[PDB]
Amino acid sequence: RARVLTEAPKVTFKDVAGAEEAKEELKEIVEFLKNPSRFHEMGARIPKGVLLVGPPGVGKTHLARAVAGEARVPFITASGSDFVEMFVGVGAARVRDLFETAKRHAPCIVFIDEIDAVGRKRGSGVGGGNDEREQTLNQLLVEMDGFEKDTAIVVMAATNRPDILDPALLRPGRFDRQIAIDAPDVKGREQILRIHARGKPLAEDVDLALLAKRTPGFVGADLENLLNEAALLAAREGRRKITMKDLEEAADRVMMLPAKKSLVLSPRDRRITAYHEAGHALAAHFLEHADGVHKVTIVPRGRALGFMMPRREDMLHWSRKRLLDQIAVALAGRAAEEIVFDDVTTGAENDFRQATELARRMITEWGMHPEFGPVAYAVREDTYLGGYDVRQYSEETAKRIDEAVRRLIEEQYQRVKALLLEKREVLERVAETLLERETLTAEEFQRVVEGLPLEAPE
Amino acid sequence: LTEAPKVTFKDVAGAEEAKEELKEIVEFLKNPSRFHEMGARIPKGVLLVGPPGVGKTHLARAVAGEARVPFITASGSDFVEMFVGVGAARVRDLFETAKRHAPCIVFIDEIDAVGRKNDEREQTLNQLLVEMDGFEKDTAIVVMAATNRPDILDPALLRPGRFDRQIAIDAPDVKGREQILRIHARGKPLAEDVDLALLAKRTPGFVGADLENLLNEAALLAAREGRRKITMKDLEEAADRVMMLPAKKSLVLSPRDRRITAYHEAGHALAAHFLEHADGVHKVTIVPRGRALGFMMPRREDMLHWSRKRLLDQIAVALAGRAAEEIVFDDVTTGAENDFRQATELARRMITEWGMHPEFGPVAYAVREDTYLGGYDVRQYSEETAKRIDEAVRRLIEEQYQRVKALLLEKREVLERVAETLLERETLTAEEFQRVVEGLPLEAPE
Amino acid sequence: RARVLTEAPKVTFKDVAGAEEAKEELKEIVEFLKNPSRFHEMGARIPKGVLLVGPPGVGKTHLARAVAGEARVPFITASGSDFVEMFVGVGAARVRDLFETAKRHAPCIVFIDEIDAVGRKRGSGVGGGNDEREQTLNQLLVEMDGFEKDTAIVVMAATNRPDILDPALLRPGRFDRQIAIDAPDVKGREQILRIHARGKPLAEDVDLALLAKRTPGFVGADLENLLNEAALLAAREGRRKITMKDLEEAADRVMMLPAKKSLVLSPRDRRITAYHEAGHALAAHFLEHADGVHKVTIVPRGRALGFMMPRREDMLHWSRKRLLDQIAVALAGRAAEEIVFDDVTTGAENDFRQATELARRMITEWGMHPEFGPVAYAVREDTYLGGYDVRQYSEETAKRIDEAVRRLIEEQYQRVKALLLEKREVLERVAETLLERETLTAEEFQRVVEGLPLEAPE
């Protein structure tokens, strides 16, 4: 094997830009870990395993390290992958070998890039892809329940995407939490840009505030490599000093660089995204039996699948009506897109998958009274090693369900569409102000709704 | 000891952007300090994607040709079969050797002997590993590595701070191997009309080394027979000859198989090229080999989110490949599987996954799973909607396929042309394509 | 555990009769292994794993040993079976223990009787028959990629039947080859007969040439036990000297001996086989758009399933037309048999399974335009641990496929049949000259076609 960071890294929370919540919510880990001792015996406690979710290069590792390097014990990191790639049984041996090594530091941090390599299980990817994960994983879970308070330590996992994880990983006693981080906040990329922008000279005409405002985009790692990029552009021309445009174009170079091919969020992909996010937002927003909440933006990217998931997994009981209205909201995105654009639409799925599920649900599992009664065509359990969904009906019923569900969805969809277009003018507005400025708080959101402008002086 | 390294690309043929995307490195290699103070930095290690004898090692030092600085050699095999801890102890002395040599290159060879996924080799691994991690900004170093199969190389090595990077070097060409045979033309004379100009041709798919070796022994086939000098024929024979053993160990393809493959790629290319509300891309070739691989990967990473018709235009392109064939050819066809496999996998996508509106709609009948080891879709729906999905997918496809067949049918010359030139001149690039397209030949350019 | 042959066996290539190709194709292993050293560093190389395919007792082991005792390192043999019979995890431990032991001899030979015990994998023989073989197998695969040139060594596998092996084993770096051996060549059984015929006296009237010519039959082990048999017949009557007929009848005794029951290739089973082989041969042979090749015989026995397999697995692109014509050829066998014989036919399958497969293929996988379009109803991949075929359509389509396929086959069949009977007179001829003489080279094959005889003086 693993990676030990000997006795302190460098870096800390003054080396990370933005993301307050993440920061302060992790507080209690940071300084708690300063003192484990007087701590546990005081009746207080800790998650003692932690996950954050964000894009690649959002500052995950970065944050983790800032913690590890401030509150601070060695930062022991490994990548999930390093694991499953291995054989039957050797995997387990490791999860532990890793731990014990990390364990003798009380307190300490286990940080694991990409725990996706483990969390999940099945009976479908049959024969090659099942056993291991759950296997070596438990080794980790057993490790997790295998403590008590003495050892102050924190397991820290990074992945772009909460779900692919078996929910077994969220249980109390290990990672019992979620902190997602949308880094690319304007001020965020200001601060970020800069911290990296120094090792290098700047033509005066360079002022971050404007580059920053016009990047988005954009992400921490993205930015750094942009900057570093420009620096070297000059570096190779035997040159010296980088005016704004060098940095600029470096921004483009990077912008077309990612993956193996040209792929760019252009003067639209943003637009599209924003008309969407407006679609949802606007939808969730109505009066007289409005069902939903409010928090708008651009580029969260792990979360759109929150409705059910975050709250579903704890408990509380939903109203049918609601569920539909919300399904409607899910489809809001597409609806918008169809409304405004070329009546060509965009491979932007998860929404459907949600609404779909909510409905397959409505029919089978929760009694909701289509032509299928209050009878349970769906069982799903969460057993300590278990906790997933599989179910008994007959080809026929299974089909009656495909039909019904498609109907639920369609009908609902058509509703939300009609509503959006009804409010269209508003649709554009929100969409727009959004796409250029890229964030709104629920209030001023609604504010742009009444057709009355606002901005803050800054 | 170590001083002025050899060659340079002045003796290297083709592989342009490869290098001058290297020139960045070569430079730091000459002028290192220039960054640290300056707050700049470099890939710090690099690898090559290509067969054996493509000019990999060749370029790996050719850099040092201009970068002009000790160019250190360590093969991967040696590390394995020494012994315990020595398997490590070597690689170690290895760098600090390469080291206060700042600037300079450290080439390693046949990584697989190391870069894999129970003791030995991976101690070499963890060793190499830690160093580069055991490391600093200030220090000026570029490691080198070359392999024919990025695949089995344990992806750990491919991290950041490590090789976050590389270049594929496409082995032959029609000109490429000519101009290579060239750099190797000087040593020895010869009397025929041919310049190798065509000889390059008479050699189908072929690699730089496989050329050089060929030559030398043509010059021997010379020297022996009491020779001055070489004949077109001599080499030529040296070629077909040295060949017949790789003919066992490698593949020849008939004046037909070529044909088609040229026509396919022609049809593909065209299909992604058209006017008035329609969508595509461009670059083209025939590479008897690198082809087969180049595909798997884009599937594993196949990602962006693209717009509904686009996908129909894609579908249009794959099926376009076949269609081209059917049109221009003897009215028989050929296992050209993967095109279909993916027009299929797209359309099937569009139905069951990305809400796109056959009589299916905004519901999610299939879901994907993700990240890497695998990534791909779990299916939830009942036999009927399965039947439907099939029916629909068949239409979607057949619809497109008869559409593209239409396009290709008509623009048919252009099909011809692109195919022909391509066929004989093993590759096209970007621009000239458009040219070949419009009543416009090329002469001997640059 | 395993079997070490201490420091040289006896036996060599002058102890093996016939089978030139096998011999000389293996050359480079033989003498290469004499010198591993100057060898690998010269840029040359080796398969370093090798399989041959032939009946039981064809001289497989025999050949392998001849190599090992000549080119020569100890001959380390084991049987595949000795393996799978074992428990979870212990298998692997062995493959290796075996190797290491064999490995310290540089160079050396691993020869494994009957590797069938491993190569294969699934998701069908579910629960008892899958895991381990792929498991312990990989152990062997990993062993295989686990080298480099230093160690000159050869893994040598024997099995009557290429297919049951997972294609994963054919990959370069380890067994990347096939050498099949039809031993029972006339001259073959001459030479063989004799080498064994010594230890014993012979009535003068005994001349091998004739026994040999009239054995076939017949195989090396078969023969030896025949001979040894006669010898003992006499041995038990307190007797001395074996005239021709003792050897003869020994031939019969053996001929009814095999398995647990009477089973004989009689004065027909040959005939049948011959009419078949002629059926194929004759079929593959036409003009004006003939599609196929030529190489006739009796008793190859591993190969009839070559069309696709050998060439399929590397690459090159087939013409539909062809594929049909060839399918037609596959069915040629049955067709003939139906034509000439009692309109009862013979449980001789593989052909059908072939044609069938080529068609199931044509429809689903390769675009070929029945009522199913150029759409991919078949995926099959070769992934390094993977490399097999499984596929997504709907009961309905699956069925449309059953129909279509049976039609393809039937229709094609009916074609070849008509063709054969059209050429019947020729059919017989080839069939016949064959049955008695048991081999033809493609040319003289045809010659017998024009109705003009030939033979060589010998």
Ligand SMILES: Nc1ncnc2c1ncn2[C@@H]1O[C@H](COP(=O)(O)OP(=O)(O)O)[C@@H](O)[C@H]1O
């Ligand atoms: N908020 C940030 N501030 C400074 N640097 C950042 C930030 N976010 C990303 N980076 C750059 O990216 C690196 C960390 O990437 P990270 O976000 O951990 O990737 P992932 O999202 O896959 O965890 C850091 O070393 C840093 O240079």
Ligand SMILES: Nc1ncnc2c1ncn2[C@@H]1O[C@H](COP(=O)(O)OP(=O)(O)O)[C@@H](O)[C@H]1O
């Ligand atoms: N572009 C090229 N120009 C000149 N020679 C080349 C070129 N490509 C390959 N060669 C010849 O092939 C030989 C081997 O090339 P290389 O790719 O280093 O082999 P390997 O793949 O075994 O490392 C070189 O010594 C060189 O003479």
Ligand SMILES: Nc1ncnc2c1ncn2[C@@H]1O[C@H](COP(=O)(O)OP(=O)(O)O)[C@@H](O)[C@H]1O
């Ligand atoms: N070509 C041959 N020459 C001499 N003996 C042979 C030959 N083929 C088979 N035999 C006899 O059979 C034995 C080898 O059997 P073998 O062919 O290896 O069985 P399998 O086909 O199962 O490998 C030899 O010891 C020998 O007695």
